[PDB]
Amino acid sequence: YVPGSVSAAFVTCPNEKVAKEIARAVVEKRLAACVNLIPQITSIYEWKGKIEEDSEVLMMIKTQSSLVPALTEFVRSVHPYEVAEVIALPVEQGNPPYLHWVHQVTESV
Amino acid sequence: YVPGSVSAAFVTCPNEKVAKEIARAVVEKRLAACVNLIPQITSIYEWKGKIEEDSEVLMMIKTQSSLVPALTEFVRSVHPYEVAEVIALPVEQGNPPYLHWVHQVTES
Amino acid sequence: YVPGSVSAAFVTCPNEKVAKEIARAVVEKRLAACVNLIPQITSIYEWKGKIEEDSEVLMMIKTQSSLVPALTEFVRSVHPYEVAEVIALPVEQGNPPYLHWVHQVTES
């Protein structure tokens, strides 16, 4: 395992149906090895000077770090918002056969 | 995008109502760009030798890394418990215009 | 605070009753200081040429970075999976007495 060669990316979505469309497509396209959907989130941020509280879904995405720029761009291309929240945090350690799988199921088309 | 220059911080609150109040507060004060609250969490740890399980709310907060010290101090004050659990993890990549927006709505 | 001396590990489990026995066991063995269980996740991934969506529980475990291999070995020895997902992310900043507490309850 090379530290930092896998990453967990977060993306938030307006509802569960868009989240699952997008989760299903990143995996079909091999941009990611798996996606965990966390429903029922409440997002709180400022917009147009006012504080909003939206009902959302958070996606946690496991992919190779070298693929996050293509993941992200795919995300921008389909996402309802027009500035989509994508962040990716490096995996330093883990289950060595899990990490390998992430690499396998996501490499070389 | 400068790697490491935005962090995602995670904070555990005893219930929705305090979590929402803190989340509102840190965003109004521009200590954070946005906060995701995740309800119906269960936390398990040792207390004075013995396993507990609490019912809580986990907050994920995005903000500039150089702001992590003040957010944490804000969270410490404001308080229910004595030791506030805040950890921040470095964001290495992501959607540039989004990360740019984080830096601007918390800017200096 | 030594940056990256604490880690946040994510483990995905089939249900609440499994995540909970593992959660209790890692805390008890002092492989971890604190575990949060996030219920009601959907996992999406390709298996056998098609998309699977399973109903699952995500655990988030705070512990000493130096303890992750022993954490991971234990998780793998008790976990129904057959390739359990365990990933760890370095905690670069946060609440120093909290982080000191993570180290004390898992002390070497």
Can you spell out the DSSP letters for A5-23?
A: SEEEEEEEESSHHHHHHHH
In contact, C55 and C37? CB cutoff 8 Å: no
CB contact under 8 A, B24 and A51: yes
Residue B49 and residue B88 in contact, taking contact as beta carbons nearer than 8 Å:
no
Declared resolution, Å: 2.2
Neighbours of chain C (3+ CB pairs under 8 A): A, B
For residue B30, give every residue at least 6 positions away whose Cβ sits within 8 Å of its Cβ, in sequence order, or none: B105, B106, B107
Report the distance separating Cα C18 and Cα C24, nearest Å: 10
Q: Which of residues 16-75 of A touch C (CB under 8 A)?
A: 16, 20, 23-24, 27-28, 33-40, 60, 62
Residue in B39, B81, B83, B30 with CA at minimum distance from that of residue B59? B39
Query: Which has the closest alpha carbon to B90: B69, B63, B108, B70?
Result: B63
What ranges do the domains of chain B cover? 1-108
Whether CATH 3.40.50.10330 fits A1-109: no
3-class secondary structure, C39: strand
Number of B/C CB contacts below 8 angstroms equals: 91
Q: How was this structure determined?
A: X-ray
Pick A36's closest partner by Cβ from C41, C69, C86.
Answer: C41
Q: Which of C37, C94, C105 sits opposite B88 (nearest CB)?
A: C94
- Asked if B83 has any chain C CB less than 8 Å from its own CB, the reply is yes
Which of C41, C44, C51 faces A38 most closely, judged by CB atoms? C41
C-beta of residue B92 within 8 angstroms of C-beta of residue A7: yes
CATH of domain C1-108: 3.30.70.120
Instruction: Report d(CA A70, CA C39) in Å as an integer.
Output: 30
Residues B10, B59: contact at Cβ < 8 Å?
A: yes
